[PDB]
Paper text:
Here, we present structures of flagellar filaments from the saprophytic spirochete Leptospira biflexa, solved by a combination of cryo-tomography, sub-tomogram averaging, X-ray crystallography and molecular docking. The resulting averaged map achieved an overall (average) resolution of ~10 Å and exhibits a series of concentric protein layers centered around a ~ 2 nm central pore, as well as a distinct array of globular features decorating the filament surface. Sheath densities were mainly localized on the outer curvature of the filament, or ‘convex’ side, thus offsetting the filament center of mass away from the central pore when the filament is viewed in cross section. The asymmetric localization of FcpA and FcpB, specifically on the convex side of the sheath, is distinct from previously characterized exoflagella but is consistent with prior flagellum electron-microscopic imaging studies performed with antibody labels. Following 11-fold averaging, improved resolution in the core region allowed for straightforward fitting of a core atomic model representing a single 52 Å repeat of FlaB (11 subunits), which we obtained by applying estimated pseudo-helical symmetry parameters to a FlaB monomer homology model (backbone-only atoms) derived from the reported flagellin atomic structure. FcpA molecules project both arms toward the core region, positioning the long arm within contact radius of two predicted loop regions in FlaB. Modeled FcpB subunits project their central β-sheets radially away from the core and present several elements within contact radius of the FcpA inner sheath layer, including one of the long FcpB α-helices (α4) as well as several loops located at the proximal edge of the β-sheet. The modeled FcpB sites are too far away from the core to make direct contact, providing an explanation for why deletion of FcpA leads to concurrent loss of FcpB from the filament.
Our structures reveal that a conserved FlaB core assembly is enclosed by an asymmetric assembly of sheath proteins with novel folds and functions. Analysis of mutant filaments, which have lost one or more of these sheath elements, indicates that the sheath enforces different core lattice geometries on different sides of the filament, thus promoting a supercoiled flagellar shape.
Author numbering:
A (entry chain BL): 114 to 219
B (entry chain BA): 61 to 219
C (entry chain AG): 61 to 113
D (entry chain BE): 55 to 291
E (entry chain CI): 233 to 291
F (entry chain BZ): 174 to 232
G (entry chain BB): 220 to 272
H (entry chain BI): 1 to 32, 37 to 76, 90 to 160, 177 to 187, 192 to 221
Write the structure that this text describes.
Amino acid sequence: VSQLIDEVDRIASQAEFNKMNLLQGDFARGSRATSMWFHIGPNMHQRERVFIATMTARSLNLKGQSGELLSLSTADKSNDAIGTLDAALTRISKQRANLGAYFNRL
Amino acid sequence: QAERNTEDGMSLIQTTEGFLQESNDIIQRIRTLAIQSSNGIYTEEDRQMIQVEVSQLIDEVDRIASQAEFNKMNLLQGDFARGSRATSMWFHIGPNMHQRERVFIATMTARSLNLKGQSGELLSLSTADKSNDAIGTLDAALTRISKQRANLGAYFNRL
Amino acid sequence: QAERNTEDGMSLIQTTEGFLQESNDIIQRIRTLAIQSSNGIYTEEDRQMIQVE
Amino acid sequence: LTEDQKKKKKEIMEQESLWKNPDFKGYNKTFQELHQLSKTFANNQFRLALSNYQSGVNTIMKNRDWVEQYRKEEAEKKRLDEKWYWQKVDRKAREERVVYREKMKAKQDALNYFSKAINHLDEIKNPDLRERPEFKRLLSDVYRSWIMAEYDLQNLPQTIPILELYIEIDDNEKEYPAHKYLASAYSFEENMIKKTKGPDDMLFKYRYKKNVHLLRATELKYGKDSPEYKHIVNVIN
Amino acid sequence: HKYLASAYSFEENMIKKTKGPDDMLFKYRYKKNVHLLRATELKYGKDSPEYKHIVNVIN
Amino acid sequence: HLDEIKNPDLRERPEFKRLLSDVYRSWIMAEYDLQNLPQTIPILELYIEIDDNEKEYPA
Amino acid sequence: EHAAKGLMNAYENTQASESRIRDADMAEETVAFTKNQILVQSGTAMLAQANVR
Amino acid sequence: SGKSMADTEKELDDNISEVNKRLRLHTVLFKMLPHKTVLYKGKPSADGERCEAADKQEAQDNTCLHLEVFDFAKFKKMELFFEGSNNADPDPRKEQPRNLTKIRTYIYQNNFLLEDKVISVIADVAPNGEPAHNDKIELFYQHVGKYILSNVENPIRNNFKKQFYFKNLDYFDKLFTKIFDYND
Amino acid sequence: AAINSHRVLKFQNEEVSKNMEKLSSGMRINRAGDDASGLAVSEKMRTQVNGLR
Amino acid sequence: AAINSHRVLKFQNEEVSKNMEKLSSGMRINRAGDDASGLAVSEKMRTQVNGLR
Amino acid sequence: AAINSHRVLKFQNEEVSKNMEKLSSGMRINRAGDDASGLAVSEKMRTQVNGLR
């Protein structure tokens, strides 16, 4: 699990397109609310905005468990840890669906 | 090419694993023999016959670790966590830089308490330990190596 | 003509390579035989047969 | 001890200091003295040569600061996927190669600057100026930092032509570290011939040169026909 | 110091029950003894019958 | 670890020889108590070679 | 007999290495073939038209 | 300037003196090899500039050492001619130095060039006298004509002792010591 | 001058031909020219497979 | 580009292959890669079965 | 020129043929060309089997 989560942090960091970072937390706002603006029509004011972000801190990042560790973290209420993974999946599934829907718009 | 590197890595990892399957079947056989040896009416002379079987199985472990190569890299002996250089099994998984992994592993007879011989008159200079700990030791040996195999297994699935 | 020279060069180089493919097939065969030869119960008489090859 | 042995002890310590790995107090001391050469010399191409050398040393100094900061930042990460011995070693192997490769880039930038420092000294054509202590000491400092930059990254064969150029300048031949590094780099090359099964002529060439500089380093630090010299005499036979 | 000593004691016991590494066994035991003795010193005073006792048990 | 002391002026130190003797003595005794007598011979022999240990009656 | 099991596992894995190192996925190479063949045909046709210019 | 030239010559005069003081010790070899080195014991002979190997190499009356150096052909030769007889005692560990009357050296291979000429023969006729004995060093030049080192302009004179003569004196003191230590 | 189409046509004819070289043997690497290192490694692997058998 | 079908084809060939690995041994777990812990436990159970016998 | 495929095709036809020689006889060694020494030894073993019977 821990390596899988570390891979997530790496995907978010290394997921580039034309040298753009498309997943780190520069969304839904940075110093400005400007985001992935696409210019869809031939004239001005014919524009769309896309937002998205993920990193391991997308969900409650629970690792480890009571007993011997070499880590500095432990898991919480088993039932909530399960609920947390549903939350993780929900948050990303919605972001993918947002992109999916956006693709269909395009 | 990154996909290829990932796949070439998968086989390297499997190669290592095959030597570790060999290693574990050895412990299981030594465990079988240890149980026979732990019989207090099983004699010292007969224990020497068992130690013939066990001692060579121990040497075979050291040889597996020593000679278990892939692409002339030694994947099991103590060249981990460092040899003349710390250079080890890096796989480059994505097309860009910072998309990297390293794998390390080590086994040799000194992976567990490498017990030889048994109380009484011997032609060696070594004896086995507390039968209960000898059993515990072989569980430790199996645990340590099976756990290492679990590392390779899981790593394969990641690739 | 320079383009031609480049291509004539390709033929020289490919010719050389083909002879080296032959040479490597030989080394691989000799290595196969060397491993058999390194077997200490594989006899000297049988090693002479290998050395013929 | 004799008056020469007492003097020698003092000089060997000064020479060991001269070849000390760079730090901030040595940086300041060095650029005090290398500028002292700019003072008397009053030559624009020497000034340019020093400006480039100083940029090269700055690359090295900035790299040393980077290496501490990088290792610090890594140490301060929470490593929750590090429950295996191999994973701890994995992350160590990540650190060492990133640090070594970054040092390799800093080495090239430092050597591009040192090469420029030499190219500017090459433009001083007047033999009355090339024989100046100002010209020779700067050229010595450029070669010394160049030798050390390569030495630290184990690029020992590359240190030989620069050590050889170094010892030809203004009694540098009488420096114990210069002969120690030459002997070690020659030893490496001898070992390369033995490991790669290279030609005997090169085996003996490298062995010979190792022994010459081994003997000379020994002579310089301990004195000729000292128990320490006499030992090297019999081994070289 | 009482809570530190008790929490360190728990961690020592975890290593003993799970058969964990010796370095952690001794680390936790050491820290238990430091805070046990310091709590004792603070409540009863240095070279009190109670201080002298805990020092003699630990050494 | 004692094997790593290579300087012959240090290996000939009374400090070096006494420890090496005490390590061998405890080694001999540990084996002796468990009746592992053949195993005690090479260690007793190494023991008596050190700094007049040959003049010891128990050895 | 133990040793044979060990050697056999290494054997299978080594053969997996040879296949993955050398043997291509014919499906994707076929896709590449088709793309390249189309581009050959497109090339030839436009030279026919380029000749008209 | 000429100041540096003067100091350089002085250092070189002392360098050849210190090695000649060591070379005079090789008397220890008369009552007594490293690779490619051949030693002969003998006596000063002919015209007094050459050393004649003894029929009896171990003879107590030998007063010259002849050392040949080979490499890959003969590369170098030295003849050490000593003043005074040897000690009667047959044990070389007890033998004392004898001031050299002469040092004669030859270079055959690995020839050095002084102002583009080879000095193939060097004849020192006062090796244990005042370090400043350039007038006692004959130079035989090939392009072998006789020149005296003291009449050499000076850099030239400095290059002679720095490049040719000191190094040969040191090389041979090195080899004679190597032989001695092996047999001592 | 013949437009760039003569470049494309030659290059695509070559890519189609290379596709044949790979496809007929089933391999990513038929020659060192495809991948010298993949080749050298598979040659080592083959001696390991055969020696092991 | 090849449509997603190239993913399915490779993956399904792999699922068929994995199915064979399991089926021939009779087991859900053939390797640690199927279940490292189920495996380790059955190894313990096997020592208990044999030791018990 | 015919690409390397003409080499592969001839060689693979031969490997198919050789495979049959082995399979129908049941043997690794059918001929001295497969293994001259394995053959000579089995011939000796056969005289030992028959002589023994």
